[PDB]
Structures are given as C-alpha cells and as structure tokens.
C-alpha cells in the first residue's frame, strides 16, 4: 500500500522531495498560531499507527514549540553554590509532551491520544497531535477507542498517560535499571528520573 511509501519518504526528509516540501511548509507554518487545528494529518502512516481513524470525533492539531532547554528564574534568597544554576537546565518533560499539553489547554473537551514529530528548523519544533472527543456516540460505539470515555481517563496527558508521558516516566524499560520506575515515580520517592 501507500503507507510504506509515505514511511519511506519520511525516513529522512533531506534525502527526498520531503526536504523541499518541509522547507516550504515551515515557511507557511511560522506565520500560523502556536496551536492550530488542521483538516488531515501530514503523516498518515504515523497517524494510523498511533490510532487515528477517519471517523467523527478525531481531530488533528499542529503545535509549534521553541527548541532548547529552560532558564531558571533568579533566586531571591540565599543559595548554596550547588543551587545557583540558571542556564544549563532542561525540562524533565519532552517537547512533544509540552506540545501535547498545549493542545490539551487549547481544546478543553477533548482528550490527547498520541502525537508525532512533523518538522523542525533551528528555532522551532512542530508536532501533530491526535485528539479524541469522548462524548461523541461514534467514538462510544467503537470498542478500539470506547475505553477513553470512562471517567478515570480524564486528563491523561496531564497525568502522564500518553506515549510521550510514558517515555518521560521511563516505562519503556523493564528489568535491570528500571527498579525506581514502577509502579510510579512518586511511589518510588520521585528519584527514578
């Protein structure tokens, strides 16, 4: 099918027409808002693998975030030399996670399912996020996604239950080296990461 061709094209954008397409696309995107809904996913194979379907209740949102780490605000009280660091710091959440949370803030009645990287220049990074409406009967009637309509699945992106959240929590490792990862970071004294 065409999914393998899309995957092959997006394997390395600079080695295909995707390089020029993305060069024009970022020029177009830099003038768009930080969070904006789009009609169809750019990477159809990635969307389908992560769970997107062509039915009512699924929306796609492109989010742009700034590259780099974070700078801590200046400390007002006294600090010891080990606590004065300001510049060389990075967020413990990935930029994909931050973009997902921004999309969740923009859309209050929807739930984050997954997201994928779609491009980046030297200043910005772009992610496309799949949102699901849990109150739509079409969504409720599909057993693949109907689980998201339950009460205890509220704010999953904020609580760290998406793929990016699990990657940040370190739930992708088992056995040696993952002692302080399960059952939760807080349950392991918050020292597993």
């Amino acid at each position: 099918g065409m999914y393998k061709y899309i995957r092959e094209a997006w394997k390395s954008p600079k080695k295909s027409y995707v390089g020029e397409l993305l060069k024009q696309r970022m020029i177009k995107w830099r003038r768009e808002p930080v969070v904006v809904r789009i009609e169809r996913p750019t990477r159809l194979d990635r969307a389908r693998a992560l769970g997107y379907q062509a039915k009512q209740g699924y929306v796609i949102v492109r989010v742009r975030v700034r590259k780099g780490g974070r700078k801590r605000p200046r400390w007002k009280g006294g600090r010891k030399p080990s606590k004065m660091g300001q510049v060389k710091y990075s967020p413990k959440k990935s930029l994909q996670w931050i973009a997902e949370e921004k999309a969740a803030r923009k859309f209050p009645n929807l739930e984050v399912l997954n997201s994928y990287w779609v491009g980046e220049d030297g200043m910005y990074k772009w992610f496309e996020v799949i949102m699901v409406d849990p109150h739509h009967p079409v969504i409720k009637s599909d057993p693949k996604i109907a689980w998201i309509a339950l009460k205890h699945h509220k704010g999953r992106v904020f609580r760290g239950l998406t793929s990016a959240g699990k990657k940040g929590r370190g739930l992708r490792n088992k056995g040696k080296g993952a002692e302080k990862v399960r059952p939760s970071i807080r349950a392991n004294e918050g020292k597993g990461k």
Binding site: P134, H135, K140, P143, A146, A149, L150, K151
Partner: protein
C-alpha cells in the same frame, strides 16, 4: 468460568458492558458477544491460547 457482562457507567452516565475476563468495554451487545467468543473460546476447547508463554502456562496448569 463465567463471562457475563458487567455494567459500568460513562462520563455522561451511559451504560457500558465490561468483560470480566479482560476488561474490555463495549456499547453493543452483539460486539460484546463476538468479543467474548473470539477471545475466550479456547477456555471451552474452541481454539488455543495465543503466545508461547501463555500456552506453556496453560499446559502446566492443566497438568
């Protein structure tokens, strides 16, 4: 083993049928029946478990 559905409620208060064996939730009774059969029929001799580890576990449990 009994595979009777368990009623659970939605955010809006709608009813869902939950499989007691795996936890999957459905809105259609036909879908629930089809899932129960196709997924757990091997417990009644209609099929075999999926996975080498599960097959070994079931063989050890049986004998």
């Amino acid at each position: 083993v009994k595979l009777k559905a368990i009623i659970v409620k939605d955010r809006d208060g709608e009813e869902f049928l939950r499989c007691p064996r795996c936890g999957m939730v459905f809105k259609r009774r036909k879908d629930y029946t089809k899932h129960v059969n196709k997924a757990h029929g091997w417990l009644f001799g209609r099929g075999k478990p999926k996975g080498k580890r599960l097959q070994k576990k079931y063989l050890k449990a049986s004998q």
